[PDB]
Amino acid sequence: ASRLAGAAADLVPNIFGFAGGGSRWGAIAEATGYVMEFSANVMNTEADKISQSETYRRRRQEWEIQRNNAEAELKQIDAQLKSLAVRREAAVLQKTS
Amino acid sequence: KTVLEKSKAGAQSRFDSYGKLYDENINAGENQAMTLRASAAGLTTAVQASRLAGAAADLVPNIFGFAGGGSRWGAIAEATGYVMEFSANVMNTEADK
């Protein structure tokens, strides 16, 4: 941005005095200098930072699902332990018999 | 029954989590990154086209005064410029989108 602004300091004062469309040419070189150096570069830079934070977001989601899978297994197992405890109590009654 | 119900809850959690990811094919930040990148590519394309329109305009009224195709060594510049600076780059810009 400052390298362009540096150059702009010598070019813009001259562009300023010319009437006309793209045929002025210097007028366009400044416009395209800015569009690439600042605007295209910034739009891409921001896009990439976002894709990276989104990449970490997606990674999080997978971990979220897997911690949930483990939790579901723990809950199912506790229920299984309870089922077994009942079976055990029945086995004790079988001994009573 | 309790054990099976806990098992079901596990399946339900996975269903809901994947059902959601499926609907959100592209996330919000992801759409924003695509948008900014498309804009950068858009502006980049405009810059290449603009600088090239200039370079081509500068050759046309002169290369037309010579016999030959690429052998005019002017017309070939228009082609080496435009094709490598713009067309090859557009074909890749689209390939990435």
Pair B59, B78: CB distance under 8 Å: yes
Q: What is residue B86's DSSP assignment?
A: I
HSE-up of A10 (CA within 13 Å, CB side)?
A: 4
**Method used for this model?**
cryo-EM
Backbone torsions φ then ψ of A18, nearest 5 degrees: -110, 125
For A19, the 3-state DSSP assignment is coil
Q: Which residue of B5, B47, B48, B85 to mutate against A (max A Cβ within 10 Å)? A: B47
How many residues belong to chain A? 97
As a whole number of angstroms, the distance between CA B27 and CA B32 comes to 9
Dist. CA A77–CA B7, nearest whole Å: 9
CB–CB of B54 and A28 under 8 A? yes
Whether the CB-CB separation of A51 and B31 falls below 8 Å is answered with no
Contact in structure between B47 and A32 (CB atoms under 8 Å): yes
Shortest distance between the Cα of A46 and any Cα of chain B, in A, equals: 7
Of the candidates B17, B36, B50, the beta carbon closest to that of A65 is on B17
Burial class (CB in 10 A: 0-12, 13-18, 19+), B59: middle
Q: Which residues of chain B have a CB within 8 Å of the CB of A44?
A: 36-37, 40-41
Q: Of A29, A50, A65, which has the smallest distance from its Cβ to B32's Cβ?
A: A50
Q: Tell me how far CA of residue A87 lies from CA of A82, A83, B3, B74, in angstroms.
A: 9, 6, 14, 93
Phi, psi dihedrals of residue A59, rounded to the nearest 5°:
-65, -40
B87 in reach of chain A (CB within 8 A): no
